[PDB]
Amino acid sequence: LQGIHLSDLSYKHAILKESQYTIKRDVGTTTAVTPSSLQQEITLLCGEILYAKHADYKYAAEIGIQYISTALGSERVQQILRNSGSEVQVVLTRTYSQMLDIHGVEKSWVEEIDKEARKTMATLLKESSGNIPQNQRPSAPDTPIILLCVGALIFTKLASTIEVGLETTVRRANRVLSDALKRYPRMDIPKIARSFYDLFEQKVYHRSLFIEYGKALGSSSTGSKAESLFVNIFMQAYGAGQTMLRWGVIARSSNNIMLGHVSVQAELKQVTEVYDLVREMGPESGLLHLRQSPKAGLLSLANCPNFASVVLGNASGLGIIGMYRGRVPNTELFSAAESYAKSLKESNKIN
Amino acid sequence: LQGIHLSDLSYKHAILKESQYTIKRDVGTTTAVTPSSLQQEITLLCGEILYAKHADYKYAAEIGIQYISTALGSERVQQILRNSGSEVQVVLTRTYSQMLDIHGVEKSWVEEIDKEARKTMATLLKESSGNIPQNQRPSAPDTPIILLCVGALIFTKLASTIEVGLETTVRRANRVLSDALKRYPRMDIPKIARSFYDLFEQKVYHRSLFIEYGKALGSSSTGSKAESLFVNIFMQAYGAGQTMLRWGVIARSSNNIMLGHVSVQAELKQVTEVYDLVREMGPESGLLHLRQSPKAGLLSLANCPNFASVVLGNASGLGIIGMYRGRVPNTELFSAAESYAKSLKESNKIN
RNA sequence: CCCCCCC
RNA sequence: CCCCCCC
RNA sequence: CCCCCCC
Numbered sequence: 001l002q003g004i005h006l007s008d009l010s011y012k013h014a015i016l017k018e019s020q021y022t023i024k025r026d027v028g029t030t031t032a033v034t035p036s037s038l039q040q041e042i043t044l045l046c047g048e049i050l051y052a053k054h055a056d057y058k059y060a061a062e063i064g065i066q067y068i069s070t071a072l073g074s075e076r077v078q079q080i081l082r083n084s085g086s087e088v089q090v091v092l093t094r095t096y097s098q099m100l101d102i103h104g105v106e107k108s109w110v111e112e113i114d115k116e117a118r119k120t121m122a123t124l125l126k127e128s129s130g131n132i133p134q135n136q137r138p139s140a141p142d143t144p145i146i147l148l149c150v151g152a153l154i155f156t157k158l159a160s161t162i163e164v165g166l167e168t169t170v171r172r173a174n175r176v177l178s179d180a181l182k183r184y185p186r187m188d189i190p191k192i193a194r195s196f197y198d199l200f201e202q203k204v205y206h207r208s209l210f211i212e213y214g215k216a217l218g219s220s221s222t223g224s225k226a227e228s229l230f231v232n233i234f235m236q237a238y239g240a241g242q243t244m245l246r247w248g249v250i251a252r253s254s255n256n257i258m259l260g261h262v263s264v265q266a267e268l269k270q271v272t273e274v275y276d277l278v279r280e281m282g283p284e285s286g287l288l289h290l291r292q293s294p295k296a297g298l299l300s301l302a303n304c305p306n307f308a309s310v311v312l313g314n315a316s317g318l319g320i321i322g323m324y325r326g327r328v329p330n331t332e333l334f335s336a337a338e339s340y341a342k343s344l345k346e347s348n349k350i351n
Numbered sequence: 352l353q354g355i356h357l358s359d360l361s362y363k364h365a366i367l368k369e370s371q372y373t374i375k376r377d378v379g380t381t382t383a384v385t386p387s388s389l390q391q392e393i394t395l396l397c398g399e400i401l402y403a404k405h406a407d408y409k410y411a412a413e414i415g416i417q418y419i420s421t422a423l424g425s426e427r428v429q430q431i432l433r434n435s436g437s438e439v440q441v442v443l444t445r446t447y448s449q450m451l452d453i454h455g456v457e458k459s460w461v462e463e464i465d466k467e468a469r470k471t472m473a474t475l476l477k478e479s480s481g482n483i484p485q486n487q488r489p490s491a492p493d494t495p496i497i498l499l500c501v502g503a504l505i506f507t508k509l510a511s512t513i514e515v516g517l518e519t520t521v522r523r524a525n526r527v528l529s530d531a532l533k534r535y536p537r538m539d540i541p542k543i544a545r546s547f548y549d550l551f552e553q554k555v556y557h558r559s560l561f562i563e564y565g566k567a568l569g570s571s572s573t574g575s576k577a578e579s580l581f582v583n584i585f586m587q588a589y590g591a592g593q594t595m596l597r598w599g600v601i602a603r604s605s606n607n608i609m610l611g612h613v614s615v616q617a618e619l620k621q622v623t624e625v626y627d628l629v630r631e632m633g634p635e636s637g638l639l640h641l642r643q644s645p646k647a648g649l650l651s652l653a654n655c656p657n658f659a660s661v662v663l664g665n666a667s668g669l670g671i672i673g674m675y676r677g678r679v680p681n682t683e684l685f686s687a688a689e690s691y692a693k694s695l696k697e698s699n700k701i702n
Numbered sequence: 703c704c705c706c707c708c709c
Numbered sequence: 710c711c712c713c714c715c716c
Numbered sequence: 717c718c719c720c721c722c723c
Contacts, residue, residue, distance in 0.1 A: 001610060003623030004603040006596060007630075012586050014634035016569030021427050023567045025574075026492075028391045085571040149710090159705050172709080176710050204573045225711090232710040241705055260702030262695060266604045289705070294574040294582035297704050302723080315707085322707030332699070500703090510719050523723080527703050576704090583703040592719055640719070648718050666721085673721030 009273045009298065013280065016295050026086045031203065032062065032103035033069035033077045034093035042067050045100060045110070047143030048117040049192070051136070051184040056112065057191035059105045061199035064151050065206055066093065066102060067144040068213040077209065084208035120186075135183050145226035146180045148213075149173075150189055151196040152233040155210060158200055159241035159289050169193035176229070207291050241289020244301045244308065244326070245278065251314040251337075254344065258313070258337040263306040271307050274299060305329035310337045317341020360624045360649065364631065367646050377437045382554065383413065383454035384420035384428045385444035393418050396451060396461070398494030399468040400543070402487070402535040407463065408542035410456045412550035415502050416557055417444065417453060418495040419564040428560065435559035471537075486534050496577035497531045499564075500524075501540055502547040503584040506561060509551055510592035510640050520544035527580070558642050592640020595652045595659065595677070596629065602665040602688075605695065609664070609688040614657040622658050625650060656680035661688045668692020 034042050046067050049060050069077045078090040091103040099110055117138060125132065134140070153173055157165035173189040174181065181187060200207055214234035217227055239246055248271070251259065258264065277298055278285050288296035301308050306329075313334035315321040318341050328334045385393050397418050400411050420428045429441040442454040450461055468489060476483065485491070504524055508516035524540040525532065532538060551558055565585035568578055590597055599622070602610065609615065628649055629636050639647035652659050657680075664685035666672040669692050679685045 001603050001619065003626050004600055005626060005630075006600045008590060008597075008637065011634040011637055012589055015566055015589075015638070016582075016586075018634070019563075019566035019570040021423050021431070021563060021567045023422050023571045024387050024390070024424065025422065027387055084573050086573065156709095157706095161706070164706075168708090172710090176709090204575060208573055229710055236709070236710075243705085243707070247707095258701055262698075262700050265702065269604060291573050292576065292579055294571055294579045295569050296579060297583045297586070300704060302704070320707075324708095325706045507723095508720095512720070515720075519722090523703090527723090580703055587703075587723070594719085594721070598721095651718060653718070671721075675722095676720045 007273070009270070009277055010280075013277055013295075013298055016298070023085055024087050026088050026205070029087075030089045030091045030103065031081070031205075032066065032093060032105065033074050033090050034066040034100070034102065035074045036070045038093060038095070038100070039067070039070035041095070041098070041100060042070050043141060043144050044139055045113070046147050047138035047140055048114055050143055050146060050180070050187045051138060052113075052117040052120040053186045053188065054113055054116050054191075056109065057188060057195050059102075059109055059195065060147060060192045061151060061196040062102065062105050064144065064148045064196070065199070065209060066100075067148065068209060071213065072216055080209055080212050081205050084205045086205040088205060140183075142224050142226035145224070145230050146177065146184075146187075147192065149177055149180075149226065149230050149233060150192045151210070152214075152230050152237070154193040154196045155200065155207075155290070156233065156237035156240060158197075158207075158237075162197055165197055166190060166193050176233070180226075204292050211287055211291065237290055238286040240286075241296065242286070242299055243324070244311065245274070245299065247315045247320065248301065248307070248311045250318075250320065251311045254314055254318070254341065256310065256314050256337055257340055258310050258333055261306070261310075261333065264310055264333075267304040267307050271301065271304055274301060306333055309333040313337025314341045317343075318345055358624070360621070360628055361631075364628055364646075364649055367649070374436055375438050377439050377556070380438075381440045381442045381454065382432070382556075383417065383444060383456065384425050384441050385417040385451070385453065386425045387421045389444060389446070389451070390418070390421035392446070392449070392451060393421050394492060394495050395490055396464070397498050398489035398491055399465055401494055401497060401531070401538045402489060403464075403468040403471040404537045404539065405464055405467050405542075407460065408539060408546050410453075410460055410546065411498060411543045412502060412547040413453065413456050415495065415499045415547070416550070416560060417451075418499065419560060422564065423567055431560055431563050432556050435556045437556040439556060491534075493575050493577035496575070496581050497528065497535075497538075498543065500528055500531075500577065500581050500584060501543045502561070503565075503581050503588070505544040505547045506551065506558075506641070507584065507588035507591060509548075509558075509588075513548055516548055517541060517544050527584070531577075555643050562638055562642065588641055589637040591637075592647065593637070593650055594675070595662065596625070596650065598666045598671065599652065599658070599662045601669075601671065602662045605665055605669070605692065607661065607665050607688055608691055609661050609684055612657070612661075612684065615661055615684075618655040618658050622652065622655055625652060657684055660684040664688025665692045668694075669696055 042063070046063050049063065074090065074092060081088050081090065093103070094101045099114060101107060102110070150169065150173055153169045153176065154165055157168050170189050170193065214231060217223065218231045285299065288299065309328050309330035310333045312321065312326060312328050314337045316334070317338040393414070397414050400414065425441065425443060432439050432441065444454070445452045450465060452458060453461070501520065501524055504520045504527065505516055508519050521540050521544065565582060568574065569582045636650065639650065660679050660681035661684045663672065663677060663679050665688045667685070668689040
């Protein structure tokens with residue numbers, strides 16, 4: 001009975017990876033970028049969104065992506081979009097009287113944001129004593145990263161739902177971005193997060209662009225505190241869409257007794273197959289659900305209901321499960337694992 | 352008695368694989384493709400099938416395959432058809448006044464579908480408040496993938512019968528494609544599935560084309576949620592036509608006691624030969640029955656009636672057998688294995 | 703189909 | 710988010 | 717001959 005072995009998942013991944021033909025999508029579409037020579041101007045825009053109370057926050061995400069394009073460069077951004085499987089033709093950004101003319105972003109919107117910000121600045125300078133510090137002004141060099149930090153907060157919740165994503169973004173940005181909120185008292189995290197979620201859902205190649213910025217930022221030798229915060233949040237998104245695997249390795253670390261049942265031990269083989277596929281893909285496996293790589297779903301543990309039920313029960317026992325919305329297929333294993341997990345958490349045993 | 356060994360199955364596969372002559376079929380036949388430059392138009396057609404209630408859904412499968420041809424490209428599609436063992440001459444697609452002239456698809460049909468869809472859109476715009484969202488319109492970019500998702504649902508049931516295939520397609524598409532059904536309330540999954548089943552049976556080289564699209568989609572770096580769903584369904588088709596091998600590895604994982612009988616232990620040698628042949632073919636072994644590769648049938652376990660009966664009994668005991676229509680040759684082994692499988696399922700043993 | 707918590 | 714002492 | 721279930 002040693003030879004009765006199939007290895008289906010490795011074969012599926014081998015089929016998906018070994019393709020001699022490249023897909024082509026978004027052939028007739030275009031997107032906007034801004035060259036690095038305009039970074040000092042786009043920073044202003046990315047900051048002129050933050051300290052004023054704007055009626056429409058619709059294209060804030062596009063301005064954050066514009067700053068990313070200034071950071072990497074226009075040619076590198078076109079190359080990134082091309083290697084992301086999307087045949088989008090980059091459209092460059094121009095200036096006019098100065099202000100920016102970003103493609104697909106109406107000049108009325110940019111003018112409205114700039115005018116609202118100028119009026120707010122004049123009002124806060126006229127009434128107050130005219131002692132605006134260097135960090136409270138729109139031309140601060142970390143304002144684009146503060147906007148991209150809200151974007152990165154909503155990036156970590158792209159596997160989740162829209163409403164859960166917005167609530168988590170607001171809750172976490174009131175604390176993660178407390179200093180920016182103090183510097184810019186009137187920044188509407190809900191609307192900016194909504195804009196970023198809309199951008200990430202509509203233009204999926206910008207997820208790849210956004211990921212490339214994270215790499216280009218994490219590999220840098222120096223950075224401000226805003227960029228370090230952005231990288232911290234960006235890395236919090238790494239295992240997005242695959243929390244079941246993380247809870248499985250947690251259960252294995254917990255030495256759950258219900259892991260030794262007959263059905264769990266029956267499915268452990270294909271479970272180890274899923275983990276081997278994770279290792280096979282390597283570093284980019286974590287970014288599969290963030291990118292909406294169609295290859296995602298090879299890492300699903302839905303084909304092991306007893307293992308999934310035991311792991312969710314262990315998570316519920318440790319209190320980790322929180323408000324996870326997954327299904328528990330086998331309730332008896334879930335409850336038994338929960339009981340053991342509570343017993344282990346409550347008990348204090350030292351070796 | 353160590354040398355009394357034959358290895359017939361390896362020899363049969365060696366004969367089949369090591370052929371110096373290539374077959375030629377469909378020599379005088381032609382098929383239609385659409386170049387990528389028309390993708391933005393074909394998308395419309397692939398979506399103009401979905402939100403209107405059409406009398407004839409006869410060539411919907413050809414429109415899905417046309418979108419696949421736009422995605423891969425005309426030259427790559429001709430090459431795919433050539434390497435699939437079929438000498439079909441590709442015929443390109445043209446436009447006229449705009450609409451498409453697909454070869455083998457009557458222009459009356461295309462005009463009828465377009466006119467029905469335009470009339471339905473006008474009716475739903477005139478009566479309603481004229482607030483059609485961006486996902487409910489025919490020009491949505493995931494509509495071709497929604498049609499190909501119905502096609503992929505009927506693709507997983509190509510080893511099954513036509514009626515079972517259509518019933519499963521409707522049942523699964525009311526749930527898998529619930530969001531598309533909400534977006535397009537009036538999409539007739541039965542008729543579209545019938546069209547796709549007819550296409551897959553008549554033109555078998557389009558199975559190879561359809562498989563190539565799955566690879567070109569699974570290997571992509573990014574994709575929409577529709578394409579991820581399509582790849583999920585496409586991978587659900589992987590072991591099609593070979594569920595007996597999957598249930599055999601399930602039985603081995605279950606540690607069924609009836610595996611140790613004399614006749615089961617007698618046939619385990621050639622059973623392991625079948626599994627070794629699976630490993631020998633490698634990743635493409637799963638796609639043999641989907642492709643109707645004549646080499647399929649080397650993976651049949653019909654020459655091991657006692658092993659097949661024990662495995663089917665184990666499956667019936669675990670409740671996995673469902674409504675499987677295979678034959679049980681040896682009823683005593685089937686019943687004994689079923690009894691042990693029920694006993695193991697009912698019993699909760701933890702190591 | 704998949705995903706779904708907290709940081 | 711992270712960091713946080715003494716030398 | 718083979719295939720045949722569910723997701």
